[PDB]
Design a protein around this ligand. Sequence first.
Ligand code: ZN
Ligand code: ZN
Ligand code: ZN
Ligand code: ZN
Length: 1271
Amino acid sequence: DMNITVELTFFEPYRLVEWFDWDARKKSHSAMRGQAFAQWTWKGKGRTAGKSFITGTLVRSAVIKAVEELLSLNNGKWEGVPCCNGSFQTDESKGKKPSFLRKRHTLQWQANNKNICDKEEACPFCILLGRFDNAGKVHERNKDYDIHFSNFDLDHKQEKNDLRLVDIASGRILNRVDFDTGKAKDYFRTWEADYETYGTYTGRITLRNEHAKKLLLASLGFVDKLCGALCRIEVIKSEDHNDELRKQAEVIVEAFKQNDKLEKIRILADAIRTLRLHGEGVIEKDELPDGKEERDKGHHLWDIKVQGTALRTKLKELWQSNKDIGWRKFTEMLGSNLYLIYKKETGGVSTEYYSKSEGSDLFIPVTPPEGIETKEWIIVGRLKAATPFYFGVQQPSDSIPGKEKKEHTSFNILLDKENRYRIPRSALRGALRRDLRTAFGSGCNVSLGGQILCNCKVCIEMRRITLKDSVSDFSEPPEIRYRIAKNPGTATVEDGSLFDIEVGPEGLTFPFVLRYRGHKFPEQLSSVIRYWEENDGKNGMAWLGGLDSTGKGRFALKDIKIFEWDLNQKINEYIKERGMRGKEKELLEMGESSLPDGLIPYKFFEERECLFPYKENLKPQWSEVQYTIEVGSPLLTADTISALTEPGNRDAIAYKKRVYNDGNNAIEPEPRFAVKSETHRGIFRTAVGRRTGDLGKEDHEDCTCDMCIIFGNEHESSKIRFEDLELINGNEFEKLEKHIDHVAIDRFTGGALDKAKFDTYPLAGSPKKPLKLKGRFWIKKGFSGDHKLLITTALSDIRDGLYPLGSKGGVGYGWVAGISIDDNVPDDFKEMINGPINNDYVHPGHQSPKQDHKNKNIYYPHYFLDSGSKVYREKDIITHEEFTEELLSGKINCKLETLTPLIIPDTSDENGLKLQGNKPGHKNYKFFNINGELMIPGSELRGMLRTHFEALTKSCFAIFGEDSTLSWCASKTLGGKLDKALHPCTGLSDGLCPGCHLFGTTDYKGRVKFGFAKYENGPEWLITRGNNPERSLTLGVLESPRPAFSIPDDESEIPGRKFYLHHNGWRIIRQKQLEIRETVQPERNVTTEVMDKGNVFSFDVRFENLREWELGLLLQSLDPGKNIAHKLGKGKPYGFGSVKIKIDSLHTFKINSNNDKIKRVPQSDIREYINKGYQKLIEWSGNNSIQKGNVLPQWHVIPHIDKLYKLLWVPFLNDSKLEPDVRYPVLNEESKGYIEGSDYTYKKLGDKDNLPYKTRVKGLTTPWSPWNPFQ
RNA sequence: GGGGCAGAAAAUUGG
RNA sequence: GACUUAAUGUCACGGUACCCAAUUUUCUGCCCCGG
Ligand SMILES: [Zn+2]
Ligand SMILES: [Zn+2]
Ligand SMILES: [Zn+2]
Ligand SMILES: [Zn+2]
C-alpha cells in the first residue's frame, strides 16, 4: 500500500531521443528507432531548452524481464512461494494490442502451483504483471493499479532555469560495416548524454499487495542495462570570445595583405593549431625562433609588422586579452578563424538507413533443462596502444543535437568532454563481432528489419556479452599528420591533395571490462581473448578504429583477470553487490582475500596452444614481415609546420613522434625519429604499380587489377597493412642532425641569386655509420603466388636502390644501402627474397696566344660563351608511370681526381677550426664532413653537370634573376635584355628544353639522380709552413660580380653564360700568405682547409627512362676527353678546384623481361651511344653537309662546342712546359700588388678612347684572348 | 673604399 | 502535480563513421670594378 522511492544511476553514456506521443511517432524514423531510450521534451518555443525523462513502461519491461530470469533460475520459486508461467498473448477480437509487441524468447518453467490464477487469489508473478486489476490499456484515475510505475525525472542538483540540449547531449554518427568488403553500407545518428553531471533519475513505484514485495525488491537489483548503459537501481527511505578573436584575426589578415603575403596566412593558421602542443611559455618567455644575426628583418614570419609592431608581441597582447578561455581553446579558435578568413578572402568557401510491421506475430516459449547451471564470468584488464590510434568523428557544427535538419582539420578524433581519449562501446562490439565471425568460420550479415531473432552462432554468443566504454587518464592534445597524393605522370604533387588527420599517442592505457552470462564459457571467445592479448613472443592483434590500412589502431590486452559467479547458489550476493557494476576498477587492484562473497577466480581458462578456433582460424589471418633498412646518406622527411614553431630558424627539419610512457605517466622527454607508414606504403604501391603497369589507368572504378586487389580501392579494403619505420641506432651518434645549406647560382653573373639561399637539417648518415630503420607490414590470408611475387619484387626494388626515402633524392638524400630480413619471417618469403672506359679525344687548344709563348701574357679569369637564341622544346614529355622497353635505365660508377687544390667548405660552423678569439669577425671553415668522413655533396656535382649539359645542348637559362637593373640610368631590367626563348620554362604547355627534360622543373621531376661522393685515397691536406693550422690557407678578397662591365652602352645584349679558366694561380696565394694576413682586414677574407692534388673521390649516378642520345650526351658531359676538365668549389678565379671525372662502370637493367638483370655494357655499346648523341647535335645544328659513318667524332666542327672546349682546356696536364698567368686588373694605380710598367689597370681599360665598348665585349666573348697587350 | 642573398613558385582536399 | 508515460508482450549491448591517396618537384654556399 506504501510507496517506494527509486533512484537509478548511470555508469556509462546513455542515449536520448525526441518525444512524439504515439501517432506522430510513426511519421519520424529516429523516434521509432529511438524507443527504449531516454526521452527529451522541449519546454517553451524556440527549440533550445527542455527536460529529459525515462518512461515508466520501460522500467516496467526491465523489471518484468528480471523477474522472469530470476524465476527461471530458481525453477519457478522464490523464497518458497511458487509462481505460474504468466500470460503474454492478447487476442485481437477482445481488446486491443498493448502498444508494444515482443519478438524475443519467453522463459517458461514447469507450473507446479496446481491452481489456476483468478482475481481472488494470485501468484506474485501475476500480481506483478498486473493481470487482475481494474486498469488496462486506457488510462483512468491513478488508483486501482495494483502495481504502478511513475515516470523518472532528471535530478538536477542546483535549482536554476531550464536546461539546454547542447549542455546535456552530443550528436554522433554510427555505422554498419560489411564483412566481405570492409566498407560501410549505411549510417544513422544518435544523441549521447553525459553521466558525470546528468546521470541520476528519481521515481516512484506503488505496490498495493504485500505478497510480491520481496520479488520486486530482488528484481530491482538484477536490472543491468537501461537506455544503452550500465545502471544501478537503489531504494531510498562565448559569442563575444568568437567575435573578439575574429576582429583580431581580420587585423592580422589585412596586415599580411598590406605586404602582399596572403598565401603565408594559411600556413600561419596551421602553426597556431600546432601551438596547442607547447605551453603558454612559448608566447610568455618568447621562445619563438629568432632571425639571423645582424639582419634588419628577423624571422620571415614572426617579424611581419601588424599595425606597427611585430607578430609575437601582437600574440602576447592578444593572449593577455583572452586569458580567460584557456590556452587550448584560444589556439584552436584562432586557427579555425584564420582558416575561415583566408577561405573568404581567397574567393572560395570550403545512405542514411534506420530499421523498420503488420503480420507474423508469434509466441515462442523456451524451457531450459532442469539440471543445467547458469554462471556469470567477468574479464577485467587493460588495453594498450601499440601504434597510434584513430577513432573517427564528424565535424563540429555538424554534430549539433538540435539543429540536425539539413573545416581546418579534415578529420578529428573522438574525445570526452574533459578532453580525454575514448574507446566507444560500438567500436569494441564491432571488433568483437568481426573476430568472433572469423573464429566461428561462418556468420550472417546483420539484418535490421527483423521479425524473427537470428539463429546464427555469432548472434547467439553476442546476445550474452556486455561491454563497457573506456576513457583514459590523459588529456593532452593530439598530433596532426599530413598526407598528399602524387601524380604518377610527372612525379609531383597532384592538385587538391593535401589533407590532415588527428592521431593519438602510442602506449596509452584504457580499462577493459567484459561480461558473459551463460551455461559454459565458449572456446571461440577464449580464442578471441587469447588472440587479443600479448605475452613473451606474441604481440597483440586487436584492430580497433578506422585507419587500419595505414597501420593505425593495433591494441594489445594485458593484466587479464577472469572471475566467476555462481547464480544457482549465490544469487543474493549478486543482488546485494549489484554485479560489481561501476566498481570494476577496484577488481584489478583487489587481493584474493578482499573479494566479495560468491565471486571466485576462474582456473580452467584454456591456454593458447589448447584452443581449436585459435591456430586454425585466427592465427593464420595476418602474417608479419619485419625488416631493417640501412640508409647510408642523409635522410630528410620534412615537416614544414613544426619547423616554424621551434627554435633554430630552419626551413626543413626531420619528423618526430611522441611516445607515451606507462611506468611514469608523463609522455617522454625525448622524441622518436621515424618515417611514416603512409610513405613506405606509397613506396610499395608505386613500385608494384610501375612493375605491372596499372598506374597508367585513368580510373579505378569497378576495377579488378592487381594493384586494386593488393592495395584496395573505393569498393574494397586493403589486403596489406603498413606500420612506421623507427630509428633504432640513434644513440650511436654524437650530433645526430647535420646542418647543410644550399644556394642557386645565376648562369650569367656566376654568383648567388637573390632570395635563393636555404637550409636543410637531415639526420647524419654515412657509408661507414649508416642509419638503421626497423619496420613491419602485415599481409592477409588468401594471397596468390603472383601477388607474393609482386611484393617480393617490390622489396628487391627497394633494396637495389630505385626508390629513395624522403625528400631531395636527386641530390643524394635518403639512398637505401641495404635491407635485412629477420628470421621469424615465413620461409617462402625468405626463399623468394634471398675495364676502364676512356674517351681518347685530344682537343687542340688556343694556339695563337698561348702555345707559342714563354709566359709573358695576362689573361682574364672568366669569359662568356655566346650561343644563338633558338631552343628546341619537346611537347611529348617522357612520363614516370612505367618502365618503357625502348628506353634505358641504370647506374654509372664514376671517380673524381683533383688536378688543382679543392675547397668545399662546411658552413654549419662559422668558427670551425679556431681563430675567432685572436682575430674576431674572421670566418674560418673546415672541409665537408659527416661523422668525420670527407665528402662532396651531390648538389654541387649536379649543378656543375647541369651547367655543362645546358651549355652543350643550347638550352634555356634555368636560374636567372630578371629583376636586376643597371646603372652607369637604364631602359629596362635585364630580363628584358634577354631573348624570350632563353627564358626559364614555365609550365608544360609550351614544352621543355633538353636541360629541363633531363634534370627537371617544378612541375616535372628529373630523370637523373646524383649521389654523395666519398673519399677513397690520396695525399690530403696541402701543408703550408707559416700558418696556425698547417692544413689551412687564407684566401684573397672576393665580392660580387658586376654586370656593368659586361654590358655597358644600353644598346647591348647579355653575352651568354660565364665560365672560368684553368690555371695554377694558387701558388701566388700560397707564397704571399704573410702579405694577406696583414694589410687586409680580417672581416673581408676567409680561412679554409684545402685538399692537395691527386686525391680520389667516388660517386654514383642513377638514371631511368633515358633515350640513347641522352645517355650518350650524359657520358660525354661526364668525361669529355683528355685535356678537358671541370671546375668545382670555392676560389675558381684564383685557380682552385680543377677536377677530372673518369667513368669506371655502366650498368643497365630491364624490368619488363622476367628473368633478366643488371649488365656490364661493354665499350662498343657506349661508343654507339656517344655517336648517337653526336648525330643528334648535328641534326639540331642544321648543317647536314657532314657525312655519316663509324668515325670517332671530332667535336670541334660545331662552333659552340669548340668555344666550350676551349674554355675548359687544361694547359698543364701531360708535361707540356707552359703555365699561363691569369689574374684580375688592379683598379687605379697606387693600389696594392701592381707591377711597375704593366699598365693593367681598370682606368685604362674602362675608358672609351682606348679600348672602346665593342672591342671590350668582343674580348670578353673570345676565349683565351690576351688582355695585357690586348690581342 | 665596400660586403650581398639568407628562401621563392605550386597543391591546403576529392571520390 | 501538470509539463511527460500506459500496463497480460520493447533482441536496439540488432548496426566499428568505415573505404581509397609517398609533405613532395626544381636550385653548385657562391662571388670584382669603381662609390
Ligand atoms: Zn500466476
Ligand atoms: Zn546473426
Ligand atoms: Zn585498378
Ligand atoms: Zn628549359
